[PDB]
From a paper:
Thus far, to our knowledge, no structures of the wider DDH family have been determined with a reduced hydroxy acid substrate. To better understand the mode of product recognition by D2HDH, we attempted to grow crystals of a non-productive ternary complex of the enzyme with a variety of 2-hydroxyacids (including 2-hydroxyhexanoic acid) and NAD(P)H, to complement the 2-ketoacid structures described above, but the crystals that were obtained were of poor quality, and not suitable for structure determination. Under these crystallization conditions the enzyme would be expected to turn over the substrates leading to crystals that might contain a mixture of oxidised and reduced components. Given that the equilibrium constant favours the production of the reduced substrate, reaction turnover would lead to significant oxidation of the NAD(P)H to NAD(P)+ and the concomitant accumulation of mM concentrations of D-2-hydroxyhexanoic acid, albeit in a mixture with unreacted ketoacid in excess compared to the protein concentration (~0.1 mM). In this structure the refined electron density was planar for the nicotinamide ring consistent with the major component bound at the active site being the oxidised cofactor. Although the electron density for the substrate was clear, it could not be explained by either a ketoacid or a D-2-hydroxyacid alone. For example, fitting the density with a ketoacid left a significant additional bulge close to the substrate C2, particularly for subunit B. This suggested that a mixture of reduced and oxidised substrate was present. Careful refinement of this structure showed that the substrate density could be best explained as a 2:1 mixture of 2-ketohexanoic acid in the abortive orientation and D-2-hydroxyhexanoic acid in a productive orientation.
Here we describe the molecular basis of the reaction mechanism and dual NADH/NADPH-specificity of D2HDH, a 2-hydroxyacid dehydrogenase from the extreme halophile Haloferax mediterranei, an organism whose proteins have to remain active in high intracellular concentrations of KCl. Sequence analysis has identified D2HDH as a member of the DDH clade of the D-isomer specific 2-hydroxyacid dehydrogenase enzyme family (2HADH), which has potential applications in the synthesis of chiral fine chemicals including alcohols, and hydroxy or amino acids from ketones or ketoacids. Structural studies have shown that all members of this family share a common fold based on two domains, which cycle between open and closed conformational states that serve to close the inter-domain cleft, bringing the substrates together during catalysis. The D2HDH dimer has an overall ellipsoidal appearance in which each monomer is folded into two domains (d1; residues 1–92 and 283–308 and d2; residues 93–282).
Residue numbers in the entry:
A (entry chain B), B (entry chain A): 1 to 308
Write the structure that this text describes.
Amino acid sequence: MHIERLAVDESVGRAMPPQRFIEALSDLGVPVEFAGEDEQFGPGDAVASFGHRDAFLDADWVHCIRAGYDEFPVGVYEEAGTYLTNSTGIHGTTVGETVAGYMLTFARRLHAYRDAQHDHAWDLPRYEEPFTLAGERVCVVGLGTLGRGVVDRAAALGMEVVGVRRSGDPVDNVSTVYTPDRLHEAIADARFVVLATPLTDETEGMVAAPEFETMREDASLVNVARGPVVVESDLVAALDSGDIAGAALDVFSEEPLPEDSPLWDFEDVLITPHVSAATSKYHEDVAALIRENIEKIATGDELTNRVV
Amino acid sequence: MHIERLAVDESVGRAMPPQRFIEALSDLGVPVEFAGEDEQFGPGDAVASFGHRDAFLDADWVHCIRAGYDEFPVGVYEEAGTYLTNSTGIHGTTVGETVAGYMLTFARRLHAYRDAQHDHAWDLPRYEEPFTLAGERVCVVGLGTLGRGVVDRAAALGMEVVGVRRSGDPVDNVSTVYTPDRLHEAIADARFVVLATPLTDETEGMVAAPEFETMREDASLVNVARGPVVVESDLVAALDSGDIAGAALDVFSEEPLPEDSPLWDFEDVLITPHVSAATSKYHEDVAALIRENIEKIATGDELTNRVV
Ligand SMILES: NC(=O)C1=CN([C@@H]2O[C@H](COP(=O)(O)OP(=O)(O)OC[C@H]3O[C@@H](n4cnc5c(N)ncnc54)[C@H](OP(=O)(O)O)[C@@H]3O)[C@@H](O)[C@H]2O)C=CC1
Ligand SMILES: NC(=O)C1=CN([C@@H]2O[C@H](COP(=O)(O)OP(=O)(O)OC[C@H]3O[C@@H](n4cnc5c(N)ncnc54)[C@H](OP(=O)(O)O)[C@@H]3O)[C@@H](O)[C@H]2O)C=CC1
Ligand SMILES: CCCC[C@@H](O)C(=O)O
Ligand SMILES: [Mg+2]
Ligand SMILES: [Mg+2]
Ligand SMILES: [Mg+2]
Ligand SMILES: [Mg+2]
Ligand SMILES: [Mg+2]
Ligand SMILES: [Mg+2]
Ligand SMILES: [Mg+2]
């Protein structure tokens, strides 16, 4: 690989202003150019993009500007001989902070107060409603960049932390790590269950009616992974039946979440519009990954975040 | 002083169910009795109360179940020989968590999402709006139990932390401690300014138009102290003018906050109903101070949290 050009697909617009991103890449040593839906690639092309296009298969290298690459046909890239990288490793602080925010919102009742603020109502909680995260248990399912960002902040707040990962191996600040076949043991005693796994064959529909049964009735689910990791209809049923207490949800089976979803109306559900990782500096964070991999290519070393 | 009785004033019901507090004081070595608003007191009586009654001055000891004793006439107690203690030392975790919650709410825009949830609207923030607390500066004004509860959590979240206290003496996790005569220096570069001082002759009206001028236009004020530490009309004016960005307010010059107050309507104000220290274990927290002081009276040692 000898890269002569970085093309920036217009789909990066879904996550950030393209112009800001192009300006963040200006002294790379190769030209950085905007590319639209209908363009052609070839030897020496690198491409930064949000979604997949078949035209990218003519390029040497595609960088997906998301951590999740579940919408990329990974097998076709391998067969085409086209390198594919992702943006894992940059979302730990933003997502960890958002999730700390969700848990504190539930513990301190901030969402109920915000509801009351609209009515100008000085509504006091029941004595038993407010609690402290200190001493409460969180189970973090997926212990990568997102999961660890959550873990570190939960641990800092004095929470008891357990979690689940594919390898079952120790993780700093996690008292007990479980393999995925022991999910029900992991979630059983947790006040919060946080989902931070990629969407894969194995994780799709992982959290469904049996898991909501196992969960504490006073527990909340947090999904910052992908919508289809949860069976959304089972989630609705569990919330209506009281199998769990509530949820903070950033990702959904259909996005935007349809207006007629029952999820919008549960008091103890927080809906956020796939923004748990949002940051005014996203363009710089992704640009740094692109720069790193340019140097890797130039010096003939293995790419950071290589999917295939 | 030899205590023969602990009277539990009915005003404790403003903070916790009195039956829960009475039962948590069962092993004091003296009887614990409820006291209505028309109750007589004499030698041997200790009282546990939320607010002041002149009737208390015939008792030997009043324990205020709040940290703030500004509604108690301290000069009137000293002259009368009646001991006064407060409940400072028990609100660090509850207030610390709530303030962390407020700051994360603003950084991650959760309040705006909650507003959109009511309308079933999938409304992304503007790109420049979401940020991370990590790397941002907070000034904590008041470095006692509440202030340290805030500091420790802000520091753990990766914030730069400075603060203000009377003595100027070092405090763990505060990088620069200022005395109150350098308030403007302390607050000028802060993204968040947090108030955690008592209401005193010195602190009343501390934060007014000139301080809102000094503060960053992108900064937010957090008030978990007492309403009159801030000049409320100057706050409204500052929020209208954009001298600051917003505020999280748990305390007000008049509580409950009047429906007609303009503070309810600012998008970037969070109103909470004097609940930043709310917890379902408050009865246990308050009882343990009372137990402590009972033992110190027996051994004839100096009381904890003695006011006069
Ligand atoms: N809401 C949002 O805006 C965002 C969502 N995401 C989503 O989060 C996902 C995770 O991203 P990131 O943390 O960067 O990814 P990482 O690759 O850093 O980590 C993935 C983690 O998931 C674990 N894992 C894999 N399969 C399973 C399983 N079956 N059960 C439990 N754990 C499993 C891995 O285990 P091991 O450690 O053993 O390998 C690893 O700990 C992305 O794929 C994306 O879908 C990402 C960014 C933002
Ligand atoms: N919203 C709520 O529900 C609650 C509100 N509060 C309020 O918080 C107040 C503080 O409580 P707590 O932290 O327990 O009290 P503490 O006595 O532990 O701490 C008070 C702090 O205020 C500092 N201070 C005093 N005067 C000034 C000033 N002029 N400028 C800067 N700092 C000053 C003191 O400085 P130094 O240490 O140097 O003397 C001390 O560090 C209470 O009096 C009460 O009004 C308390 C509990 C709950
Ligand atoms: C969109 C950029 C991050 C958000 C999510 O898409 C991801 O997988 O990273
Ligand atoms: Mg309710
Ligand atoms: Mg259940
Ligand atoms: Mg707006
Ligand atoms: Mg930051
Ligand atoms: Mg003054
Ligand atoms: Mg002044
Ligand atoms: Mg209104």
